[PDB]
């Protein structure tokens, strides 16, 4: 292995890119069993999160900083940078990182780096005394030791290109896509990679070919080379130079692109006719490099250099996703919640079986909707005839009431309006309009137990429960009738074939009680709660029919005082009684 | 990027550099649908970039006849914001054979230029002849020969201009519609239209897709086009790509290669290049034709199951895996 | 709603028009970046001058 081994540990510099690196670094950690790479990231867009990082099945929170200086703090471990930052901030970053005396080894993937920038950092790489790898590199492998970067693909190429152990080959390529390949003919004719290095596809990359092999060269493992590179600069040049320069003990195989001097000193023949003189291994098309691999490890067999040792692992294999389990019934997930009134999973939803949209376009409404999304069956049209007009009568009753008014208050604080109407919508219970399920049960209850005997079920009311659900009004009374219940009831008496034994029980007490007190008379609530029962609607929704109207007030509300530029309410002291402990003295603790 | 003559001389003038007065719509001649009118002893002038910095050439015989005068040219090596002083420069233009008040006068300009380099992220500015009138000491640079490096513009807001065409010809429909595709994604979409060929490249990857075009020009074929996609590019304009090449006429082959692929899911890329090619046979074009698939990278599997289906569609594909030498599709394709 | 808007009624619909062109731009930088139903809700009242304050 040459730059990146079992010691190397990065910070990435960068956002998205960065993690899906970090992400692949983590495979890769996995399969040859060591710890971690990547230590920090630094991103001051994400500064204080931090991503999950699965090593296997095992998640690894990696923390962002702002900068690399706390970073570096917190993880004094670190050696290795790699940026993922785009061109207008990359070299700043590569700057930051060389400058920083732990980091030895900065990376680049960045594509459209400016020269003079490149320029500026190989020279500052160089006076540092440290690496620089790019720009424009997809990363370091080391098989069986450190991956630095995407490069390698995969999981399953890892395994096929036997990443996990050290092999006699080393890989040099200006493109990233064909170290990739170069890694795979380097396991299928030869006996696998001991590192390769993608320099960059850039006119100065930080440190080019020569820099490398002359660590190849030091690299006991390394045998030969797979240098891939093209038409364009002296870089293939200066290594066909260092090639013939000394006796090197490592053997190079060289493929050059761009040939294509058929079609319109950097050239191509000039480059394969400088190395195959130099003495390198240099094939006519690159199908020829897989026959150039098979030659120099035949050699490296025969020369006792490689040793015929079967891959001895039982290799470790990436756990699969929950859903995947399962989809093949491996494995129990019971459900956090079961929900049986609509299903969304599909290109639109469908409420109690029945697509929405087909439910607009054959003409039902809201309140066929309501019917099923509560009942989870489609209303008849004299069910739906009622719930409309129930929604309509009750949809508001003006500021003064709690619901409202407590929309009010929140729209005049300042608070947005599903927040607002929250507030509102808390007010509905056993004083304001949500007793329309007690007066269902009670009345149908008064129907059954107390038939003729409504003194009787007065009394009982009174020792067991307190005030009758769906009895009394603040406003309304005897002398000031609620045109709300007379309209209702009249509609359901005159306009429908129901036959209601809960609303004409309730409209019997309603005689009696209003003979006690002239307000005590049956209530919206009440109202609906007896039609609802009688119509023989599940007991859990009654009081949807409050909550969901009196929604249509509330909102209402809300606007207007939007539209008013209302501002905060703070309430008149001349409304207030403060009966409050006279004013003391606290004591000593 | 080479860059027009009238942005050029803009940045030269930016830099006070001797321009003659021009006029972009006395000599004429073309950007045809731009042409330029400009006012009409000979010096060469040129700096050219290098790993360490530039390296300033000078010559007192400009014009036609520098070719010959090759051993008249004085070079120096600007290293990296090292820039020479004036009287470096004077030196410089004195040993090229410039006397006292014009020595001093090359230099001048010479750090203009230097500073015109530095400041402009050129690659190259070459100026042949840098033309003076004794008379008054009026200087003019009369060729101007700039490269500039594009991927820098961020950095300049005052570049109001696009570089020159990389073959000698101006681009086509096709190749400007791949381009204007290409800027809009975050991935890599390239296309070159080679006049004539039989075979068709649809490659993944700068690297692989050169490789290609080698094997098929060395197998004694011809090559229909040039197309590259990497960074792992958006189906739709893999499917704009594949689209462009099977709209090329009297193609035999198609070489749908690559290498292994780091991170292009193949899967997704390749879902784009069966739509396109879908979309292509029944409007009647890949009549014919025999594909040619040979494919890694992540989601391979997937990918390659979906290509090899297009075989009950009755296309006459032909799909390999990694075993499959990368550029030996081509040998396949050339004895069909 | 799109359909129902453009098919059943004669309405034009600037706000709709341009959200649906913006979509064209959005999902071709990600897929899921299509014109939700708050999108197409807020474009529709907005089309048919509803108060701003209501659309929510
Ligand atoms: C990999 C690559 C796409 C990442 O670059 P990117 O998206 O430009 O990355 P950034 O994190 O710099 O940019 C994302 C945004 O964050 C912003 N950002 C980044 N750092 C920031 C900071 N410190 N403060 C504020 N904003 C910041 C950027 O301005 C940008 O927003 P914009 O698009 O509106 O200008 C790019 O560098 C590239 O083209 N690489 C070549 C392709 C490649 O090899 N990809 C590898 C895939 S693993
Ligand atoms: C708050 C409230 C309970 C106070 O009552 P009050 O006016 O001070 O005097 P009472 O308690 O005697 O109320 C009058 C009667 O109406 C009854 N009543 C009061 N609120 C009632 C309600 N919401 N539902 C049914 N009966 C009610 C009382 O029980 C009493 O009847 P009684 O003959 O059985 O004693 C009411 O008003």
Sequence with gaps: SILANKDTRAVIIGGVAGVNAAKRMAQFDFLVNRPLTVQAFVYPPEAGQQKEIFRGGELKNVTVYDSLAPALEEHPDINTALIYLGASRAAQAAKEALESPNIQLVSMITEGVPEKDAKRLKKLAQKLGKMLNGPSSIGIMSAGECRLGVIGGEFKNLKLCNLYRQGSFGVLTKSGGLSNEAMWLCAQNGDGITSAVAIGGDAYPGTDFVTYLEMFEKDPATKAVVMIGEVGGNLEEEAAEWLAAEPRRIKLIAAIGGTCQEVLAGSARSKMNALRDAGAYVPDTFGGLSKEIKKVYEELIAAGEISTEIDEAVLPELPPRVQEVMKQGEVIVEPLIRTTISDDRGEEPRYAGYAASELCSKGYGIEDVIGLLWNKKLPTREESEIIKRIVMISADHGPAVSGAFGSILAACAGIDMPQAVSAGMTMIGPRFGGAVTNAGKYFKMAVEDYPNDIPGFLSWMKKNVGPVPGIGHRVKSVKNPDQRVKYLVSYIKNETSLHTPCLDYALEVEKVTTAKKGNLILNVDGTIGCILMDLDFPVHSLNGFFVLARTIGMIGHWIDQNNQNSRLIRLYDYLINYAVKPEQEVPEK | ?336
């Design chain 2, 1 to 336: 990027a080479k860059i027009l003559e009238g942005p050029a001389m803009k940045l030269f003038n930016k830099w006070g550099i001797p321009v003659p007065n021009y006029v972009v719509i006395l000599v004429v001649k073309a950007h045809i649908g731009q042409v330029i009118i400009a006012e009409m002893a000979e010096f060469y002038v040129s700096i050219i970039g290098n790993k360490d910095g530039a390296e300033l050439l000078i010559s007192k015989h400009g014009g036609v006849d520098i070719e010959d005068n090759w051993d008249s040219v004085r070079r120096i090596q600007i290293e990296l914001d090292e820039n020479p002083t004036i009287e470096q420069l004077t030196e410089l233009a004195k040993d090229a054979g410039f006397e006292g008040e014009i020595a001093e006068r090359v230099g001048k300009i010479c750090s203009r230029l230097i500073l015109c380099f530095d400041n402009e992220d050129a690659q190259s500015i070459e100026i042949n002849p840098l033309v003076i009138r004794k008379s008054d000491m009026r200087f003019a640079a009369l060729d101007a020969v700039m490269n500039v490096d594009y991927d820098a513009r961020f950095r300049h807001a005052d570049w109001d201009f696009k570089p020159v065409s990389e073959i000698g010809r101006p681009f086509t429909e096709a190749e400007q519609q791949i381009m204007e595709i290409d800027s809009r994604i975050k991935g890599s979409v390239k296309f070159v239209e080679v006049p004539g060929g039989e075979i068709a490249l649809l490659t993944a990857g700068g690297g692989a897709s050169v490789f290609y075009a080698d094997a098929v020009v060395a197998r004694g074929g011809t090559i229909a086009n040039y197309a590259e996609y990497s960074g792992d590019p958006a189906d739709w304009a893999v499917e704009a790509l594949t689209e462009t090449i099977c709209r090329l006429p009297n193609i035999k082959h198609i070489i749908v290669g690559g290498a292994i692929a780091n991170f292009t899911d193949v899967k997704a890329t390749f879902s784009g290049i069966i739509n396109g090619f879908r979309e292509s046979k029944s409007k009647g074009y890949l009549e014919g034709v025999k594909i040619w698939v040979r494919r890694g990278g992540p989601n391979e599997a997937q990918g390659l199951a979906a290509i090899k289906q297009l075989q009950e569609e009755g296309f006459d594909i032909h799909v390999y895996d990694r075993s499959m030498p990368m550029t030996d599709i081509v040998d396949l394709a050339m004895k069909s």
